[PDB]
């Protein structure tokens, strides 16, 4: 039913995750640069 | 006002969404559980005469 | 502008859906597959 | 006010361009109708009314253009 | 084997059996799923023969 | 808690109460809800074979599924005239396209390295034609990534505003005409038609987004 | 103000011409319908509701151009 | 504030001109669907999603022109 | 300045008019794919990727028009 | 200088129209390619290259138009 049979969750999904992290670093500085508040 | 009329109209549309004039997916689903149930009658019995 | 609790949270949402699908209902669909497979045999 | 009426007339004239659609639409509809009726006379009775309806709809779009041009004329 | 026939006639959960109960009845059903993922046989055939894929139109 | 975040919480509240909160028949059927998602699950699974198949289609299946779920749910409840849908900014749809492309290349650069640059020259286009094609191919790679994000969000914005603009006209019509009848139900009739279109387009554009992001994954994993 | 209203008028008039594309789209849909029913009379029932759908989509695009002209006029 | 608004309206109109191509395109994709299914009744399930997808592409194309128009409206 | 922004707006609007061809092009590409699958259903799998390739190229044309329009805007 | 830059923007917006022709042309090339390949699967290998090159420089024509628009902008 919800019997957890292990499947790839992080083993092969790393590239998009590290891409997201590389986005995040800079993704907050873009708002800081264009504060306009 | 105008906003209240729009919600009432979609509720009528949602009422028409309720009908779909005997929706196909209802019968498309109806064909499924019978198909699912019937094969379990045949498949389980298939090994029943295996010991028979 | 506002990104903190949405994009990181978006990937966390994808991870949660990944769990609740691939660990729960992919095994469920597979389990019914193999269940009826052994029902025939 | 002079420029207002001037551009109103200009807008009506440029809105009348839409009749090109009605014209070449009835054009292609009747061309297909001729091709179909020549293919076999049996299908003519079934195909003519819907071709007429398509003509009516294309010229209804043309009439919409004409009406908006009319609003930019009176 | 006669008791098996009497066993099957009144013990047919064809509409209410549990797959986890199938795990309990045979650990092989449990066993055969883990090494399936680890060895890389992600795709599973043998389904469309019995149930259609149920493709939307 | 911005409008985006609270909407995102509402998304997951609906997500769990379709298939996670039935879980009682211990069968493949027994609830027409289950038939619904497995239909969608099968349409994308066979699509995963048809587009990503050959070595690792099932490996990358969930991202296409999760993204399709994300776009599908975000487009369902988007018709009500007070639907402040996705903060009326839709900037994240661009962001999702950007991160999807950016992850696509890192996978390409990781799995191919310098060979990823050979993708710009599929079959022919010799040295005189090499600079022209690599310019078209590389600029295209930026091109459809940004286009994918903007087209979905703008049309949702376009659909939401054409809800309101036509609605204001109906308010004008029903207030001015005294005894006649054909002034407000025909504008109501278009409102009924234009709402079905917006509901319809979101369904396919979620599918189109699913097919597209699938299409770019092929190019990353497979060089042609 | 006068030039603003004048520009609104001419912009609406130029935006009207979407009905041209709507009419041609519905015309080509009906033309393909005619050819299909003539070649295969049996396929007529399968293709007619689809043709109605395509008609509706093209005329919806044209009518939306009409409302764009309307909002340029009155707004 | 006057001339800029006027040119904004004119740019909005000459960008709304773009929906012509989108309509003609969706219609011709669907026309090809009609002809293909008429010649081959068995390919309907194979070709219908493809033509619907092409429809969505061309409609999003016209909607892009529409958005370019809106950014010069509000 | 005001005339500069006005011409920016009108130039963006008249840059928008180059994507009707992109829409018609992607449409005729998908139409030809429908026709080819009608004639040769078996070759559909081989022939489909070129459809998306041509779609991407014509969309690239349309967004080149977008790039001109947007650089004219902001 | 105001009118000079204004008309430079207008000219760039008019010039970027070449992508319309580029897209229509590459799409008719693709359409003929698909029709021929479906009608002749064996011809695919020897009809791919010049079709690729042809729509490549058909797009290069629109690229030349875009470059004219660029020089008008700058």
């Amino acid at each position: 039913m919800l019997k957890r049979f292990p499947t790839p969750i992080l083993k092969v999904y790393w590239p998009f995750f590290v891409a997201g992290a590389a986005v995040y670093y800079g993704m907050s500085k873009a708002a800081d640069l264009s504060s306009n508040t | 006002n105008d906003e209240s009329i729009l919600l009432l109209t979609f509720l009528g549309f949602t009422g028409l969404v309720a009908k779909y004039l005997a929706p196909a997916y209802k019968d498309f689903a109806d064909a499924r559980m019978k198909k699912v149930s019937d094969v379990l009658n045949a498949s389980r019995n298939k090994h029943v005469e295996a010991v028979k | 502008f506002y990104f903190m609790n949405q994009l990181t949270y978006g990937f966390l949402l994808m991870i949660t859906l990944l769990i609740l699908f691939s660990q729960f209902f992919l095994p469920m669909i597979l389990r019914l597959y193999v269940s009826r497979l052994f029902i025939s045999k | 006010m002079q420029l207002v009426l001037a551009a109103k007339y200009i807008g009506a004239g440029i809105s009348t361009i839409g009749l090109l659609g009605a014209g070449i639409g009835i054009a292609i509809v009747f061309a297909a109708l001729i091709n179909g009726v020549s293919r076999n006379p049996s299908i003519k009775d079934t195909v003519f009314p819907m071709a007429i309806l398509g003509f009516a709809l294309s010229e209804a779009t043309g009439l919409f253009c004409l009406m908006v041009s009319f609003l930019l004329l009176f | 084997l006669q008791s098996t026939l009497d066993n099957i006639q009144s013990a047919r959960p064809f509409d209410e059996l549990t797959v986890d109960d199938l795990t309990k009845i045979k650990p092989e059903i449990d066993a055969k799923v883990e090494e399936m993922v680890k060895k890389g046989k992600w795709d599973v055939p043998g389904y469309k023969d019995r149930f259609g894929n149920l493709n939307v139109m | 808690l911005t409008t985006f975040s609270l909407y995102t919480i509402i998304v997951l509240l609906v997500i769990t109460s379709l298939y996670t909160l039935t879980n009682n028949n211990n069968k493949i059927i027994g609830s027409r809800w289950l038939i619904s998602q497995e239909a969608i699950y099968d349409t994308i699974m066979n699509m995963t074979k048809g587009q990503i198949g050959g070595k690792n289609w099932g490996l990358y299946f969930p991202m296409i599924f999760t993204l399709f779920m994300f776009i599908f749910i975000a487009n369902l409840i988007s018709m009500i005239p007070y639907s402040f849908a996705l903060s009326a900014h839709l900037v994240f749809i661009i962001s999702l396209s950007i991160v999807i492309w950016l992850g696509n290349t890192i996978l390409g650069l990781y799995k191919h390295g310098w060979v990823f640059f050979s993708l710009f020259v599929p079959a022919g286009t010799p040295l005189p034609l090499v600079p022209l094609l690599v310019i078209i191919e590389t600029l295209s790679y930026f091109a459809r990534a940004i286009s994918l994000g903007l087209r979905l969000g703008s049309n949702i914005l376009a659909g939401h505003l054409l809800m309101v603009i036509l609605a204001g006209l109906t308010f004008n019509f029903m207030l001015i005409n005294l005894f006649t009848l054909v002034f407000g139900f025909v504008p109501l009739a278009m409102i009924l038609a234009i709402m079905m279109l917006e509901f319809a387009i979101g369904i396919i554009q979620g599918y189109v987004w699913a097919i597209l992001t699938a299409s770019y994954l092929k190019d990353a994993v497979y060089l042609h």
Side-chain angles (χ1 to χ4, degrees), chain F residues 4 13 24-26 54 58 97-99 102 125 139 150-151 160-161 184 199 205:
Chain F
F4 273 122
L13 182 62
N24 58 358
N25 298 114
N26 289 315
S97 68
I98 292 289
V99 297
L102 193 152
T125 80
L139 286 175
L150 61 83
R151 65 165 188 77
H160 165 252
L161 65 90
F199 200 50
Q205 293 179 357

mmCIF file of all heavy atoms in Angstrom, chain F residues 4 13 24-26 54 58 97-99 102 125 139 150-151 160-161 184 199 205:
data_model
loop_
_atom_site.group_PDB
_atom_site.id
_atom_site.type_symbol
_atom_site.label_atom_id
_atom_site.label_comp_id
_atom_site.label_asym_id
_atom_site.label_seq_id
_atom_site.Cartn_x
_atom_site.Cartn_y
_atom_site.Cartn_z
ATOM 1 N N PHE F 4 2.436 33.648 -2.919
ATOM 2 C CA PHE F 4 3.019 32.463 -3.542
ATOM 3 C C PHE F 4 3.116 31.309 -2.550
ATOM 4 O O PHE F 4 2.754 30.170 -2.868
ATOM 5 C CB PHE F 4 4.403 32.793 -4.096
ATOM 6 C CG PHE F 4 4.393 33.353 -5.490
ATOM 7 C CD1 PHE F 4 4.954 34.591 -5.755
ATOM 8 C CD2 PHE F 4 3.858 32.626 -6.540
ATOM 9 C CE1 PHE F 4 4.963 35.104 -7.037
ATOM 10 C CE2 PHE F 4 3.862 33.135 -7.825
ATOM 11 C CZ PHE F 4 4.415 34.376 -8.074
ATOM 12 N N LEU F 13 -2.082 20.573 -0.061
ATOM 13 C CA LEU F 13 -3.291 20.120 0.618
ATOM 14 C C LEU F 13 -4.200 19.365 -0.343
ATOM 15 O O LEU F 13 -4.776 18.330 0.008
ATOM 16 C CB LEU F 13 -4.023 21.313 1.236
ATOM 17 C CG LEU F 13 -5.285 20.988 2.035
ATOM 18 C CD1 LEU F 13 -4.950 20.102 3.225
ATOM 19 C CD2 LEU F 13 -5.974 22.264 2.490
ATOM 20 N N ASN F 24 -7.364 2.280 0.967
ATOM 21 C CA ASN F 24 -8.156 1.392 1.812
ATOM 22 C C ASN F 24 -8.586 0.086 1.160
ATOM 23 O O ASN F 24 -8.838 -0.881 1.891
ATOM 24 C CB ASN F 24 -9.414 2.115 2.319
ATOM 25 C CG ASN F 24 -10.290 2.625 1.192
ATOM 26 O OD1 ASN F 24 -9.957 2.486 0.015
ATOM 27 N ND2 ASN F 24 -11.419 3.225 1.548
ATOM 28 N N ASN F 25 -8.680 0.010 -0.165
ATOM 29 C CA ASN F 25 -9.216 -1.189 -0.799
ATOM 30 C C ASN F 25 -8.174 -2.278 -1.011
ATOM 31 O O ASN F 25 -8.553 -3.414 -1.316
ATOM 32 C CB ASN F 25 -9.864 -0.831 -2.138
ATOM 33 C CG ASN F 25 -11.038 0.116 -1.982
ATOM 34 O OD1 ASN F 25 -10.989 1.263 -2.425
ATOM 35 N ND2 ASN F 25 -12.101 -0.362 -1.345
ATOM 36 N N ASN F 26 -6.885 -1.964 -0.855
ATOM 37 C CA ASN F 26 -5.801 -2.933 -1.030
ATOM 38 C C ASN F 26 -5.835 -3.583 -2.412
ATOM 39 O O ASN F 26 -5.389 -4.720 -2.587
ATOM 40 C CB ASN F 26 -5.831 -4.006 0.064
ATOM 41 C CG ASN F 26 -5.414 -3.469 1.419
ATOM 42 O OD1 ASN F 26 -4.424 -2.747 1.537
ATOM 43 N ND2 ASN F 26 -6.171 -3.821 2.451
ATOM 44 N N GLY F 54 15.426 3.949 -23.718
ATOM 45 C CA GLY F 54 16.596 3.321 -24.294
ATOM 46 C C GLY F 54 17.683 2.982 -23.295
ATOM 47 O O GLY F 54 18.270 1.899 -23.381
ATOM 48 N N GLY F 58 13.206 5.504 -17.183
ATOM 49 C CA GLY F 58 12.588 5.405 -15.873
ATOM 50 C C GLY F 58 13.393 6.051 -14.770
ATOM 51 O O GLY F 58 12.834 6.373 -13.716
ATOM 52 N N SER F 97 11.814 27.432 -15.676
ATOM 53 C CA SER F 97 12.435 27.193 -16.975
ATOM 54 C C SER F 97 13.941 27.410 -16.916
ATOM 55 O O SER F 97 14.708 26.672 -17.547
ATOM 56 C CB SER F 97 11.801 28.098 -18.031
ATOM 57 O OG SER F 97 12.125 29.457 -17.796
ATOM 58 N N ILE F 98 14.385 28.426 -16.173
ATOM 59 C CA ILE F 98 15.814 28.723 -16.092
ATOM 60 C C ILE F 98 16.558 27.594 -15.387
ATOM 61 O O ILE F 98 17.590 27.113 -15.868
ATOM 62 C CB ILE F 98 16.044 30.076 -15.394
ATOM 63 C CG1 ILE F 98 15.541 31.223 -16.272
ATOM 64 C CG2 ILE F 98 17.515 30.265 -15.061
ATOM 65 C CD1 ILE F 98 16.391 31.468 -17.505
ATOM 66 N N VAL F 99 16.046 27.156 -14.234
ATOM 67 C CA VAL F 99 16.727 26.102 -13.489
ATOM 68 C C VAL F 99 16.661 24.774 -14.236
ATOM 69 O O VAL F 99 17.598 23.971 -14.166
ATOM 70 C CB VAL F 99 16.159 25.988 -12.062
ATOM 71 C CG1 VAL F 99 16.413 27.277 -11.291
ATOM 72 C CG2 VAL F 99 14.678 25.654 -12.085
ATOM 73 N N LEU F 102 19.336 25.086 -16.787
ATOM 74 C CA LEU F 102 20.654 25.161 -16.166
ATOM 75 C C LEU F 102 21.086 23.795 -15.645
ATOM 76 O O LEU F 102 22.261 23.420 -15.744
ATOM 77 C CB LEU F 102 20.639 26.208 -15.049
ATOM 78 C CG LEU F 102 21.966 26.685 -14.448
ATOM 79 C CD1 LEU F 102 21.816 28.107 -13.934
ATOM 80 C CD2 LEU F 102 22.452 25.789 -13.332
ATOM 81 N N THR F 125 26.967 20.139 -42.113
ATOM 82 C CA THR F 125 27.334 21.533 -41.884
ATOM 83 C C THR F 125 28.840 21.665 -41.687
ATOM 84 O O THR F 125 29.306 21.845 -40.554
ATOM 85 C CB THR F 125 26.578 22.103 -40.681
ATOM 86 O OG1 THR F 125 27.211 21.678 -39.468
ATOM 87 C CG2 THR F 125 25.130 21.626 -40.690
ATOM 88 N N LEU F 139 22.280 29.640 -29.509
ATOM 89 C CA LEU F 139 21.282 30.667 -29.227
ATOM 90 C C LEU F 139 19.897 30.056 -29.071
ATOM 91 O O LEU F 139 19.091 30.527 -28.261
ATOM 92 C CB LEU F 139 21.278 31.727 -30.330
ATOM 93 C CG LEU F 139 22.445 32.715 -30.336
ATOM 94 C CD1 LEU F 139 22.368 33.623 -31.553
ATOM 95 C CD2 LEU F 139 22.464 33.532 -29.054
ATOM 96 N N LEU F 150 7.971 31.905 -20.257
ATOM 97 C CA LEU F 150 7.174 33.113 -20.451
ATOM 98 C C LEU F 150 5.811 32.800 -21.059
ATOM 99 O O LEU F 150 4.816 33.452 -20.725
ATOM 100 C CB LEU F 150 7.945 34.122 -21.309
ATOM 101 C CG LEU F 150 8.374 33.807 -22.748
ATOM 102 C CD1 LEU F 150 7.262 34.056 -23.764
ATOM 103 C CD2 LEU F 150 9.616 34.608 -23.112
ATOM 104 N N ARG F 151 5.744 31.811 -21.955
ATOM 105 C CA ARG F 151 4.490 31.543 -22.653
ATOM 106 C C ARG F 151 3.417 31.029 -21.699
ATOM 107 O O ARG F 151 2.247 31.412 -21.810
ATOM 108 C CB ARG F 151 4.718 30.554 -23.799
ATOM 109 C CG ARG F 151 5.158 29.164 -23.371
ATOM 110 C CD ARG F 151 5.019 28.164 -24.504
ATOM 111 N NE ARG F 151 5.252 26.798 -24.052
ATOM 112 C CZ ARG F 151 4.368 26.073 -23.380
ATOM 113 N NH1 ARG F 151 3.175 26.552 -23.068
ATOM 114 N NH2 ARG F 151 4.689 24.835 -23.014
ATOM 115 N N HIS F 160 -6.514 35.290 -17.111
ATOM 116 C CA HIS F 160 -7.109 35.876 -15.914
ATOM 117 C C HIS F 160 -7.655 37.273 -16.188
ATOM 118 O O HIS F 160 -8.715 37.646 -15.675
ATOM 119 C CB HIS F 160 -6.087 35.911 -14.778
ATOM 120 C CG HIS F 160 -6.481 36.801 -13.641
ATOM 121 N ND1 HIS F 160 -5.871 38.011 -13.395
ATOM 122 C CD2 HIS F 160 -7.432 36.659 -12.688
ATOM 123 C CE1 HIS F 160 -6.424 38.575 -12.337
ATOM 124 N NE2 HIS F 160 -7.374 37.775 -11.888
ATOM 125 N N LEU F 161 -6.934 38.069 -16.980
ATOM 126 C CA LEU F 161 -7.387 39.434 -17.234
ATOM 127 C C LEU F 161 -8.575 39.454 -18.189
ATOM 128 O O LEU F 161 -9.461 40.308 -18.067
ATOM 129 C CB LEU F 161 -6.237 40.288 -17.769
ATOM 130 C CG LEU F 161 -5.611 39.987 -19.132
ATOM 131 C CD1 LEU F 161 -6.318 40.756 -20.243
ATOM 132 C CD2 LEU F 161 -4.129 40.312 -19.108
ATOM 133 N N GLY F 184 -26.982 40.510 -22.107
ATOM 134 C CA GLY F 184 -26.102 40.055 -21.050
ATOM 135 C C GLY F 184 -25.804 38.572 -21.042
ATOM 136 O O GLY F 184 -24.731 38.162 -20.591
ATOM 137 N N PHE F 199 -9.409 26.859 -18.923
ATOM 138 C CA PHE F 199 -9.268 25.573 -18.250
ATOM 139 C C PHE F 199 -8.644 24.535 -19.175
ATOM 140 O O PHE F 199 -7.805 23.735 -18.746
ATOM 141 C CB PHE F 199 -10.626 25.090 -17.741
ATOM 142 C CG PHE F 199 -10.534 24.064 -16.646
ATOM 143 C CD1 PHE F 199 -9.735 24.286 -15.536
ATOM 144 C CD2 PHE F 199 -11.242 22.876 -16.730
ATOM 145 C CE1 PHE F 199 -9.648 23.343 -14.528
ATOM 146 C CE2 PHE F 199 -11.158 21.930 -15.725
ATOM 147 C CZ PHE F 199 -10.360 22.163 -14.624
ATOM 148 N N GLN F 205 -1.089 22.696 -22.041
ATOM 149 C CA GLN F 205 0.192 23.374 -21.856
ATOM 150 C C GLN F 205 1.011 22.733 -20.744
ATOM 151 O O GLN F 205 2.247 22.743 -20.803
ATOM 152 C CB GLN F 205 -0.018 24.863 -21.587
ATOM 153 C CG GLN F 205 -0.575 25.614 -22.782
ATOM 154 C CD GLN F 205 -0.793 27.085 -22.504
ATOM 155 O OE1 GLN F 205 -0.584 27.559 -21.388
ATOM 156 N NE2 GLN F 205 -1.208 27.818 -23.528
#
